[PDB]
Design a protein around this ligand. Sequence first.
Ligand SMILES: *[C@@H]1O[C@H](CO)[C@@H](O[C@@H]2O[C@H](CO)[C@@H](O[C@@H]3O[C@H](CO[C@H]4O[C@H](CO)[C@@H](O)[C@H](O)[C@@H]4O)[C@@H](O)[C@H](O[C@H]4O[C@H](CO)[C@@H](O)[C@H](O)[C@@H]4O)[C@@H]3O)[C@H](O)[C@H]2NC(C)=O)[C@H](O)[C@H]1NC(C)=O
Ligand SMILES: *[C@@H]1O[C@H](CO)[C@@H](O[C@@H]2O[C@H](CO)[C@@H](O[C@@H]3O[C@H](CO[C@H]4O[C@H](CO)[C@@H](O)[C@H](O)[C@@H]4O)[C@@H](O)[C@H](O[C@H]4O[C@H](CO)[C@@H](O)[C@H](O)[C@@H]4O)[C@@H]3O)[C@H](O)[C@H]2NC(C)=O)[C@H](O)[C@H]1NC(C)=O
Ligand SMILES: *[C@@H]1O[C@H](CO)[C@@H](O[C@@H]2O[C@H](CO)[C@@H](O[C@@H]3O[C@H](CO[C@H]4O[C@H](CO)[C@@H](O)[C@H](O)[C@@H]4O)[C@@H](O)[C@H](O[C@H]4O[C@H](CO)[C@@H](O)[C@H](O)[C@@H]4O)[C@@H]3O)[C@H](O)[C@H]2NC(C)=O)[C@H](O)[C@H]1NC(C)=O
Ligand SMILES: *[C@@H]1O[C@H](CO)[C@@H](O[C@@H]2O[C@H](CO)[C@@H](O[C@@H]3O[C@H](CO[C@H]4O[C@H](CO)[C@@H](O)[C@H](O)[C@@H]4O)[C@@H](O)[C@H](O[C@H]4O[C@H](CO)[C@@H](O)[C@H](O)[C@@H]4O)[C@@H]3O)[C@H](O)[C@H]2NC(C)=O)[C@H](O)[C@H]1NC(C)=O
Ligand SMILES: *[C@@H]1O[C@H](CO)[C@@H](O[C@@H]2O[C@H](CO)[C@@H](O[C@@H]3O[C@H](CO)[C@@H](O)[C@H](O)[C@@H]3O)[C@H](O)[C@H]2NC(C)=O)[C@H](O)[C@H]1NC(C)=O
Ligand SMILES: *[C@@H]1O[C@H](CO)[C@@H](O[C@@H]2O[C@H](CO)[C@@H](O[C@@H]3O[C@H](CO)[C@@H](O)[C@H](O)[C@@H]3O)[C@H](O)[C@H]2NC(C)=O)[C@H](O)[C@H]1NC(C)=O
Ligand SMILES: CCOCc1nc2c(N)nc3ccccc3c2n1CC(C)(C)O
Ligand SMILES: CCOCc1nc2c(N)nc3ccccc3c2n1CC(C)(C)O
Ligand SMILES: *[C@@H]1O[C@H](CO)[C@@H](O)[C@H](O)[C@H]1NC(C)=O
Ligand SMILES: *[C@@H]1O[C@H](CO)[C@@H](O)[C@H](O)[C@H]1NC(C)=O
Ligand SMILES: *[C@@H]1O[C@H](CO)[C@@H](O)[C@H](O)[C@H]1NC(C)=O
Ligand SMILES: *[C@@H]1O[C@H](CO)[C@@H](O)[C@H](O)[C@H]1NC(C)=O
Ligand SMILES: *[C@@H]1O[C@H](CO)[C@@H](O)[C@H](O)[C@H]1NC(C)=O
Ligand SMILES: *[C@@H]1O[C@H](CO)[C@@H](O)[C@H](O)[C@H]1NC(C)=O
Ligand SMILES: *[C@@H]1O[C@H](CO)[C@@H](O)[C@H](O)[C@H]1NC(C)=O
Ligand SMILES: *[C@@H]1O[C@H](CO)[C@@H](O)[C@H](O)[C@H]1NC(C)=O
Lengths: 751, 751
Amino acid sequence: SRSYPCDEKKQNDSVIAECSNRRLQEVPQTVGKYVTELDLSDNFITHITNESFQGLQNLTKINLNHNPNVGLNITDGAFLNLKNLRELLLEDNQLPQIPSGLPESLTELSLIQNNIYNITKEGISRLINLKNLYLAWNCYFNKVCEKTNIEDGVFETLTNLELLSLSFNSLSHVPPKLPSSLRKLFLSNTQIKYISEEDFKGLINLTLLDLSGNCPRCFNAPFPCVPCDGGASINIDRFAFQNLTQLRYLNLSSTSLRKINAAWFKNMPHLKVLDLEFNYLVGEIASGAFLTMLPRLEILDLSFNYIKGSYPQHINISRNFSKLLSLRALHLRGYVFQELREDDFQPLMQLPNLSTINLGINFIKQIDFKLFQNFSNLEIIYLSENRISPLFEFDPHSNFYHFTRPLIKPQCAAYGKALDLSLNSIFFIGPNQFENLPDIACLNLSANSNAQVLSGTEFSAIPHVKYLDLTNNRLDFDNASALTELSDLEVLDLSYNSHYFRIAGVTHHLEFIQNFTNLKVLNLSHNNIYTLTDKYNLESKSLVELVFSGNRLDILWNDDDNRYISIFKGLKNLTRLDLSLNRLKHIPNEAFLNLPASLTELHINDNMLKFFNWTLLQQFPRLELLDLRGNKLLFLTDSLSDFTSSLRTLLLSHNRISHLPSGFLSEVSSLKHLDLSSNLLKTINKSALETKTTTKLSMLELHGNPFECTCDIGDFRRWMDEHLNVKIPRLVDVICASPGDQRGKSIVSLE
Amino acid sequence: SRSYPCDEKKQNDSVIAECSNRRLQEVPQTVGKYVTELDLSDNFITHITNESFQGLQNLTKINLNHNPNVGLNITDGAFLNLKNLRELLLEDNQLPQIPSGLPESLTELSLIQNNIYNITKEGISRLINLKNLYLAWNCYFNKVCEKTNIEDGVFETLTNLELLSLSFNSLSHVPPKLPSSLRKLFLSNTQIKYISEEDFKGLINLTLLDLSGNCPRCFNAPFPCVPCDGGASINIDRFAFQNLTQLRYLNLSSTSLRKINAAWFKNMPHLKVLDLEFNYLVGEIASGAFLTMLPRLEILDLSFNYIKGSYPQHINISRNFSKLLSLRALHLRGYVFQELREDDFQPLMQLPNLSTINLGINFIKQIDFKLFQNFSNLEIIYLSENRISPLFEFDPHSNFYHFTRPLIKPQCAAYGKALDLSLNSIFFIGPNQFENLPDIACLNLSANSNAQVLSGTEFSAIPHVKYLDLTNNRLDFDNASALTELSDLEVLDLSYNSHYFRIAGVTHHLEFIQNFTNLKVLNLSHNNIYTLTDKYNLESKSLVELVFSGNRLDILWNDDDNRYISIFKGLKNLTRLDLSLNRLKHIPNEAFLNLPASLTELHINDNMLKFFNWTLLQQFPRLELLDLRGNKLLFLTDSLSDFTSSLRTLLLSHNRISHLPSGFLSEVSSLKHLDLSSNLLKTINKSALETKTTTKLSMLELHGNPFECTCDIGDFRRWMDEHLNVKIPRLVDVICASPGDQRGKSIVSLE
Ligand SMILES: *[C@@H]1O[C@H](CO)[C@@H](O[C@@H]2O[C@H](CO)[C@@H](O[C@@H]3O[C@H](CO[C@H]4O[C@H](CO)[C@@H](O)[C@H](O)[C@@H]4O)[C@@H](O)[C@H](O[C@H]4O[C@H](CO)[C@@H](O)[C@H](O)[C@@H]4O)[C@@H]3O)[C@H](O)[C@H]2NC(C)=O)[C@H](O)[C@H]1NC(C)=O
Ligand SMILES: *[C@@H]1O[C@H](CO)[C@@H](O[C@@H]2O[C@H](CO)[C@@H](O[C@@H]3O[C@H](CO[C@H]4O[C@H](CO)[C@@H](O)[C@H](O)[C@@H]4O)[C@@H](O)[C@H](O[C@H]4O[C@H](CO)[C@@H](O)[C@H](O)[C@@H]4O)[C@@H]3O)[C@H](O)[C@H]2NC(C)=O)[C@H](O)[C@H]1NC(C)=O
Ligand SMILES: *[C@@H]1O[C@H](CO)[C@@H](O[C@@H]2O[C@H](CO)[C@@H](O[C@@H]3O[C@H](CO[C@H]4O[C@H](CO)[C@@H](O)[C@H](O)[C@@H]4O)[C@@H](O)[C@H](O[C@H]4O[C@H](CO)[C@@H](O)[C@H](O)[C@@H]4O)[C@@H]3O)[C@H](O)[C@H]2NC(C)=O)[C@H](O)[C@H]1NC(C)=O
Ligand SMILES: *[C@@H]1O[C@H](CO)[C@@H](O[C@@H]2O[C@H](CO)[C@@H](O[C@@H]3O[C@H](CO[C@H]4O[C@H](CO)[C@@H](O)[C@H](O)[C@@H]4O)[C@@H](O)[C@H](O[C@H]4O[C@H](CO)[C@@H](O)[C@H](O)[C@@H]4O)[C@@H]3O)[C@H](O)[C@H]2NC(C)=O)[C@H](O)[C@H]1NC(C)=O
Ligand SMILES: *[C@@H]1O[C@H](CO)[C@@H](O[C@@H]2O[C@H](CO)[C@@H](O[C@@H]3O[C@H](CO)[C@@H](O)[C@H](O)[C@@H]3O)[C@H](O)[C@H]2NC(C)=O)[C@H](O)[C@H]1NC(C)=O
Ligand SMILES: *[C@@H]1O[C@H](CO)[C@@H](O[C@@H]2O[C@H](CO)[C@@H](O[C@@H]3O[C@H](CO)[C@@H](O)[C@H](O)[C@@H]3O)[C@H](O)[C@H]2NC(C)=O)[C@H](O)[C@H]1NC(C)=O
Ligand SMILES: CCOCc1nc2c(N)nc3ccccc3c2n1CC(C)(C)O
Ligand SMILES: CCOCc1nc2c(N)nc3ccccc3c2n1CC(C)(C)O
Ligand SMILES: *[C@@H]1O[C@H](CO)[C@@H](O)[C@H](O)[C@H]1NC(C)=O
Ligand SMILES: *[C@@H]1O[C@H](CO)[C@@H](O)[C@H](O)[C@H]1NC(C)=O
Ligand SMILES: *[C@@H]1O[C@H](CO)[C@@H](O)[C@H](O)[C@H]1NC(C)=O
Ligand SMILES: *[C@@H]1O[C@H](CO)[C@@H](O)[C@H](O)[C@H]1NC(C)=O
Ligand SMILES: *[C@@H]1O[C@H](CO)[C@@H](O)[C@H](O)[C@H]1NC(C)=O
Ligand SMILES: *[C@@H]1O[C@H](CO)[C@@H](O)[C@H](O)[C@H]1NC(C)=O
Ligand SMILES: *[C@@H]1O[C@H](CO)[C@@H](O)[C@H](O)[C@H]1NC(C)=O
Ligand SMILES: *[C@@H]1O[C@H](CO)[C@@H](O)[C@H](O)[C@H]1NC(C)=O
């Protein structure tokens, strides 16, 4: 009754087996008969037939992707016996052709990343229930492939299709006879030079059109890239877009566009996001008669339109930018200019809804920051990666021309207005630096190569910063009053400042941490801190989370030094502590007891520990999570239930533990989750996990243990069938060691 | 006849067994009877008796250090049976007392890092042949320990002792009745406040005296440090040093010295190295009547004498520095001043033999570099770690107050005069920066946070640099003429410049490498290079070694891109190639053949490789070393001898290989060294390593393989005894896997 090899979960009242990554040479027949969704993805299966999926009714979905992993042979009508399948995922299977005789029940089919160069009536036209069809990434780049032949009006018979992606195939022409029902159509990187009037003419329901990468701009492309003759523009008919009144999204990126016809937008009152990236638009950004046509546009991406070899003094913004009323975010990146002036952004200053200006990668030497205060709604000022001074490698399921991640880390932005100066040249903060800025909750100073001693006078122009990123500088903390002018400070990231800390002869002062009443999260990671000056303790009444990882506690806690024994005790509010990567061989008993007793979460993981005193857990009544992972530990206590009543989760994975003590799990009612994976365990005696009282443990991880496959594991196997509420994951990965006959075989298979 | 557990080598015609780190619970009786030196260090041995070392004549030396590893019990006169022992190393054994009844044959004894607080006539006085005696590091710091009692005139009876180290013990007084034969005597950190006239009075042969750490300067000490009352100076008698005419070395460091008596040096015409570190000497460096007493002093270390809280404009050097004629290196570090002026170093400019000035850690903002040209002999200018702008944790066997490593990397210094600007603020190189400098062969620019585009005009003031360290900056290579003004350039280190390289939208230009006729070693490591602009190939006719490690060849060599296929082919002189850490799953065949055919050494190690085409080795007739270590490789060819005649060394360690092919080792006469360690091998068939022709293989590493201990390994065990010229190391670490009975046991032990 324990599901194998498939792990089974419950989602939306429904039933889904996860068989992915299971090294399956063939499709299991042991699948739960109730299963709605079957994921075979990333396996070794080389064959599909009519016997494979039998006995299975409610399956609406099959993921066959990535088989076999590092030549999938499918029989005609192998999938026909199943009338309930909507979604079918065949991606990355090295398929020569579309599989013949697919069920007509298919709403959604994914052929992405295959060898199919021929789209035929036989493979498609008989599926009338097709909603979304993905053919993308079959013929592209320098791959050896045939130009894609698309049989006349093959999609003509699909009256229900709202999504079609042919992107990254060799087409050269938009296929004739496209169904009216089309909503989203992806034509990107199809090598199409010409868009006629009659191509999209009959689609009135299109909400999205992707023409990107046709007549590409190939200079400095990090992919094989072939431009149109002379590197000319795509030729788009004056009337090509006239009958799309419903279009929300238009991706024109990398089309080599020098000038844009404003009459393309005549019929599109609803245009929302316009992607103009990777063209030559500097002239159009200077004048831009096409802007007056976009009153509803929310997002506009003009990024990377730079003229080759040019490094102008100022950016030139058309006054017509005042005509985009609903604009929210504006991306200008790789425009490459020297100096941003107050009067250059004038057209943007009256835009009511524009919260985001992306200026990244412009090589800007200087800005007057009083212009950002003359805007209305700005929540995000993204200046990252500039010169500002003081005073398959491509995911077919992702956007090709930019990253889809947030500009600012959501944790930071949630506090308020955001200013990202990261990856710049400001190595020193002058008294006047931040003057005339808005009220800044979130400030990113990361990677500014800042060597200064912070005296507490630096941020006084913007005292209300909640979240401060100082990461990856070389910071000299010689002053006890540092950063104290920020009274409302909550999150502080000091990570990767190790420059001065690692020099012993200089002075280091951390005392500033006590002065913060609201301080909550503090990152002190990877600072290589082995020594401090006159003050050996970190003390805060507010602080909650402290990440001390990547420092030397092996030195601080050295047996011959009593000075740092209390180092964390002064943090009385602290529920979370990260001691990882400190090279700890052991923790002196006196130093462990001096840990804050408020801790609910403690990570000592990824150290060298050969010893752990479990009796010391008596002093931590609030501790729900203990992370011991990635150590040398040989030793487990049998008395643990006498040591802690509070422990929900215990992670022991990747240790040297060879033996489970008799009465280990007994009488501890708290422990839900136990990670024993990747240990030295040969067997489990009957008396290890037996608990006379009530056992709340719902998860046990045994994978990676050298199990003796003899009759001695009968006690444990029996224990497994006796409790089915304990989930052991990766049951194909719990693998018998000895005897040599049973080596490689799962423990769940035995006489 | 295969030595076990001890590995045996030959040094100085002699015979030494290495038993270290062998997890020995007891002292082996299997030791080769001829053995001169026996190293038991870092083992589990808990006992020593009279039966341990029997049958062994010529042993002159025994290393018992670090036993047991993580309570050594020695019987009275356990070592007496051996009349040939000179050296005895007992270090770090947690010894309560000196072992009683030690042989009188001992010239050298090391008790370092033990619990011995009592030095008695019974343990020592009967050994008259003692030459060097190390008692150091028994009672120190915050360790729980007893003040050291030294029985009256216990060393009085040792007439042959030239070396005594009591350092880091609690003494408070220099022991009375010291033998005349003393040459080197280490009293450091013994808590001695007073040096009387009669302490050292009777030692005329002393070449070395270490008084360091008595009355320590404890501000900002990274160890528990207790000063004398008021933090006063050590009190040294006017006449204390009068009878040492032979003293070469004097370590006074960390004695809290405000002023120095010049009459201490009255009788020392031979003084060579004087260590003054960690005192308050700023006044003495300003006047210093003691300098006129040191005509022969070669090294003078004044480092870390800074006045607390002081940041003066200029350093003040006494005119009396002109009076040290034989001075070679001068260390002034942590003097902490702002500005170095031409006229401040005037007293030093006429010193004929002074090649080295160590200015590190002074927080210097500016220097006029034309003063270094007014010296005579300077080979080393060490400016590292300053503010200059544009335009147990302690090793008992090491120096406690500084690092003993070279200032400049020897490879760099060997080229000529050296200038180390590393760890500074110069973020831009102006045209006039290096003007008025000497002729610089070796230049360290590391860690200057330099973002500039090097145009080839930058170094023209010092064109003759052979070795250039640009490591750990953020370098923008946008120019093809970069660095080309250096015609004689040999070694170039570009490591850790990854800042701009990882941005795809910008341009990257490596073309400058071809312009160098003498370029030999090039470090391009950890630059995260996945993309380049207009030039996809590295080309040099001279270049020999290229380290490409820490980049992305997984991206560059992606199957869908032909652009970078030839990337290294243009280097026609290259004998050494490092492809490590490139995340390579596989190398496309066309890309491997495009590797330089001149390669004698190739490292692909520490990648993800699941595949290697051995047939491609046919194209590398010069290749003596192939490094495949740290990969996923499952597959070994049986045909290798047909593939390469040139391969001396093959490193396969840490791979997934489960099987040795029949006829693997056969007919390849070239292979000396084979590393199979840490693989999946269960057994070795008789036909794997059998070679009908002449076999030159002298080294085979099998440790870490899950060996079946059944009778099936008889074929291999037999093969081992049949060839004794093949050295298998770590024979305690070649460990039987199955059956469970033999698990943990070395394969060399079987029925
Ligand atoms: C030209 O410009 C257009 C318009 O911006 C771009 O069109 C977008 O293309 C991307 C890439 O395909 C789309 O992003 C993906 O959307 C998939 C569909 O999600 C929809 O439905 C789900 C629920 O069913 C909703 O949650 C979601 O909001 C959408 O409504 C997602 O399945 C994808 O995510 C999956 O893959 C990614 C990457 O592996 C993972 O991160 C996810 O966890 C998940 O597994 C992905 O989000 C996007 O939907 C398109 N926009 C529109 C409006 O349709 C073109 O890409 C662009 N041209 C190019 C090539 O640059
Ligand atoms: C220096 O140190 C600080 C302090 O730790 C780090 O900042 C924290 O970083 C961790 C990431 O490592 C962040 O934790 C992550 O938070 C996400 C929270 O997302 C929000 O929105 C979701 C809904 O989408 C809500 O559910 C949630 O409540 C939040 O409001 C979580 O999504 C993440 O959890 C997921 O991953 C974790 C394991 O990582 C699993 O346990 C979860 O089940 C789930 O799979 C994770 O919690 C944390 O938010 C950061 N906090 C702060 C203050 O920023 C810095 O990143 C670190 N910097 C450096 C340089 O290392
Ligand atoms: C005050 O100042 C004095 C004078 O400078 C310092 O005295 C030096 O102390 C150090 C530390 O003990 C000595 O360094 C060590 O010397 C040992 C002896 O080497 C001699 O003999 C060998 C061959 O037998 C020669 O090769 C060598 O040149 C010497 O003639 C070495 O054995 C040590 O090296 C071993 O340990 C180190 C560290 O583990 C390893 O790096 C080595 O590989 C090796 O295993 C070490 O080199 C030094 O000899 C002393 N100088 C003199 C002139 O005797 C004091 O240390 C200083 N006071 C303090 C505490 O700061
Ligand atoms: C960027 O890349 C460059 C190029 O590789 C690196 O520079 C090389 O660094 C390696 C060290 O990793 C250096 O190689 C080492 O050289 C030592 C040579 O010492 C000299 O003197 C000895 C006598 O004392 C002579 O025998 C010798 O001929 C030399 O004249 C060797 O001692 C080292 O070998 C020892 O270690 C190696 C393994 O490391 C063993 O194989 C040996 O048997 C022995 O145990 C080693 O050879 C090399 O010298 C450097 N060359 C240059 C040009 O500097 C940079 O370090 C790297 N930088 C960064 C930032 O990573
Ligand atoms: C301040 O600015 C710096 C630099 O721009 C920001 O660092 C960047 O943060 C992003 C988001 O976390 C990182 O990208 C992510 O990396 C992880 C790990 O590989 C990956 O899982 C994610 O999918 C995403 O790719 C990025 O690594 C990092 N960049 C650098 C230079 O390290 C930082 O986030 C900013 N801080 C705040 C609070 O905004
Ligand atoms: C240029 O200046 C930099 C910075 O001072 C030098 O880097 C430093 O080099 C030394 C010598 O190699 C490194 O010390 C060594 O580290 C290794 C690895 O841990 C260790 O095995 C050695 O015993 C020694 O401790 C040191 O790591 C490194 N410092 C930094 C900041 O990384 C560099 O050597 C200089 N280049 C030249 C050519 O002089
Ligand atoms: C030789 C170093 O010992 C102390 C020290 N530590 C620092 C430090 N972390 N930062 C500094 C910044 C500017 C000037 C001096 C210092 C300094 N200093 C120098 C001094 C001004 C005496 O504190
Ligand atoms: C948007 C980036 O695309 C090209 C580029 N790459 C670089 C570069 N690696 N470095 C630069 C330094 C100063 C000014 C401009 C650039 C630059 N630029 C800008 C430009 C002047 C057009 O080359
Ligand atoms: C601005 O956005 C708000 C929603 O936050 C919306 O109510 C308002 O109508 C928008 N104004 C314009 C000009 O689009
Ligand atoms: C910190 O710096 C401020 C301003 O430079 C100064 O007033 C104060 O003395 C410093 N605090 C110290 C040294 O503890
Ligand atoms: C301790 O943390 C809690 C939870 O964040 C917070 O409410 C409280 O203010 C903190 N205590 C102090 C003294 O700030
Ligand atoms: C564990 O900690 C306790 C303190 O409660 C101490 O008595 C005991 O010695 C420690 N155990 C070990 C093995 O150090
Ligand atoms: C300087 O050093 C050389 C050896 O290189 C030596 O011959 C000469 O006598 C020394 N001069 C002085 C003043 O010590
Ligand atoms: C490199 O820089 C020099 C000086 O700035 C300039 O003369 C030359 O044009 C540049 N070379 C290029 C861009 O290839
Ligand atoms: C190739 O390397 C050798 C050995 O260092 C050197 O002698 C020769 O000059 C190099 N060849 C060229 C063309 O510089
Ligand atoms: C190995 O390389 C040779 C070229 O000599 C090629 O013919 C063969 O296909 C390659 N082997 C594999 C398994 O790719």
